[PDB]
Design a protein around this ligand. Structure first.
Ligand code: HEM
Ligand code: HEM
Ligand code: CYN
Ligand code: CYN
Lengths: 123, 130
């Protein structure tokens, strides 16, 4: 024991985490313009990626191949301000789904680092 | 008579401490690598030492603290190109040279590490690399 995926609560917790996150993303002025109007598909892939990243089944790469995550974000203007907005929505999502304690810090530190890596545009 | 574990054969903790500290120095200077690593590699180095210790047959310091390495999953968000894997291995080679790691243990460790690096690659090659 115990993968971050099991510690965070498994599929059930990822489901609601990402559903709540997508809701906040869709309502954030800094993010809603660059995401799809319908985030269903986006959220489906976010669940895949977070699942596989945190030690669950290899959902994302089994369907979409190599993650190449920064490259998939290149077509979008991802500014430091937008990275902040993203993490701000993940923070609220984790608060709303009960993700606390060491797993919260573990996951958020790694997504904050990842979000920094996605930045491809100055403010 | 017990053969040495690979971790013993390389010189144990004192070697792994020196090798990783040296490696992380090269990493932080490598233009292909430093952008994606944290600015302060101290936590990364601490984890690398723990990983490599158990990776080579020492105690399970990494798994006991962090859980299963699952390194391909843990590297999923990071832009790991074939080039950056070679840079990684290049810094390890230089680090091994600086720390005195030679012989069968060096080739055993490097060849295993070269397999792991290739498995971390999660971004296609760039133009000219086909
Ligand atoms: C730094 C701020 C970020 C912004 C502004 C951003 C924005 C976006 C946008 C607009 C898309 C397109 C969605 C679609 O076409 O369906 C996308 C895709 C995606 N993003 Fe993010 N993102 C950010 C960071 C992250 C982070 C930290 C992760 C960590 C897991 C992540 C994982 C993904 C995944 C898995 C996809 C699906 C890619 C695909 O297969 O098409 N992103 N992102
Ligand atoms: C192939 C080129 C590689 C690149 C570019 C690379 C890059 C990175 C980066 C940017 C991180 C994030 C640092 C952090 O969050 O602390 C990381 C974490 C890590 N890497 Fe690598 N890596 C590579 C290969 C390897 C190899 C070959 C090994 C082991 C033999 C390894 C073991 C680790 C470990 C244990 C961690 C810490 C994960 C954690 O517990 O958070 N990596 N790597
Ligand atoms: C990406 N959210
Ligand atoms: C990884 N270093």
């Amino acid at each position: 024991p115990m993968t971050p995926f099991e510690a965070i609560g498994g599929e059930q917790c990822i489901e609601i985490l990402v559903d709540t996150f997508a809701s906040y993303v869709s309502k954030h002025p800094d993010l809603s313009p660059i995401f799809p109007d319908d985030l269903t598909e986006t959220a489906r892939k976010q669940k895949q990626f977070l699942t596989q990243y945190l030690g669950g089944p290899n959902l994302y790469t089994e369907e979409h191949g190599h993650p190449m995550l920064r490259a998939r974000h290149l077509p979008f203007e991802i500014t430091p301000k937008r990275a902040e907005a993203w993490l701000s929505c993940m923070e609220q999502a984790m608060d709303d789904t009960g993700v606390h304690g060491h797993i919260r810090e573990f996951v958020f530190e790694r997504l904050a680092l990842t979000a920094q890596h996605m930045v491809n545009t100055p403010n």
